[PDB]
């Protein structure tokens, strides 16, 4: 199991020690407060009122937690995933990323605390 | 394992099928959008900017997800719990509850989708 912080201003994302293999079942829990600029802060689901202006993941709100598995496209994580199985053709190391517009991570603040575990399968 | 919705306007709380027993390790993942009154909506962590005016759980923000276990007091759940063990002498059925002031649930809206499972020990 992996546990760590994902900083909102980390454009490259946080690499985990988790390698998703075909058939794996995983659970993720994410908590905390972060911002993509404003003085306010949002949780792992991000800001539901902010328009998508070129987010790295169009399937989640700005300020949400998302992930990549290997060289996949971005996948929404939000508050987390419960005993979750990846789509076929997806496999590799899990990198966690704060959802923002590329090149704009500089003024981000806060972070999410995240646990990732592999479940029984 | 249990999966279900916890309505924000349910003052009595949502009873689950989970009975917490001594030594149990559990994981919870909660997601969604709810409100304790305003047109705006907040995730499972609630509204970090709203003052506590007599909430059923003083250890969580207004609009956060909390729980009771048997006859325990309220325990914060927020976005969820990862492989979590209960405090001493805490056991019994798990009931999930939206954190609000007693007698004011009437104007609440939305809900959280919640998964609860027991982990291997
Ligand atoms: O026009 N607004 O209401 C508005 C409010 C907040 C804004 O924050 C902006 O969001 C961008 C992403 O969408 C970038 O994250 C940028 O760093 C940030 O300042 C940008 C515009
Ligand atoms: O003083 N305010 O700014 C203020 C704004 C919104 C408020 O919503 C209020 O919150 C209460 C809990 O603290 C109750 O949930 C009440 O039903 C709700 O209308 C209550 C007060
Ligand atoms: Ca930003
Ligand atoms: Ca209310």
Residue numbers in the entry:
A (entry chain B), B (entry chain A): 1 to 121
What does the study report here?
In the case of the opportunistic pathogen Pseudomonas aeruginosa, which causes lethal airway infections in cystic fibrosis and immunocompromised patients, the formation of biofilms plays an important role in antibiotic resistance and disease progression. Biofilm formation is mediated in part by the galactose-specific lectin LecA (PA-IL) and the fucose-specific lectin LecB (PA-IIL), as evidenced by studies with deletion mutants and the partial inhibitory effect of simple fucose and galactose derivatives in vitro and in vivo.[5a, 6] Understanding the glycoconjugate–lectin interaction is a key feature in developing potent biofilm inhibitors. Herein we report the first case of P. aeruginosa biofilm inhibition with a multivalent ligand targeting the galactose-specific lectin LecA, using the related β-phenylgalactosyl peptide dendrimer GalAG2. The structures of the lectin–ligand complexes were investigated to gain insight into the molecular basis of glycopeptide dendrimer–lectin interactions.
In the structure of the NPG–LecA complex, the galactosyl group binds in the same orientation as free galactose, with the characteristic coordination of the C(3)–OH and C(4)–OH groups to the lectin-bound calcium ion.[18a] The nitrophenyl group occupies a hydrophobic groove adjacent to the glycoside binding site, with van der Waals contacts to residues Tyr36, Pro38, and His50. Residue His50 not only forms a hydrogen bond with the C(6)–OH group of the galactose, as observed in other LecA-galactose complexes, but also engages in a T-stack interaction with the nitrophenyl group. The C(ɛ)–H group of the imidazole ring is located 2.5 Å from the phenyl ring and points towards it. However, an intermolecular T-stack of an aromatic ring with the C(ɛ)–H group of the histidine imidazole side chain at a distance of 2.5 Å is unprecedented. This interaction probably contributes favorably to the binding of the phenyl galactoside to the lectin. Binding of the tripeptide portion of GalAG0 to LecA causes an average 0.66 Å inward movement of the phenyl linker relative to the position of the nitrophenyl moiety of NPG.
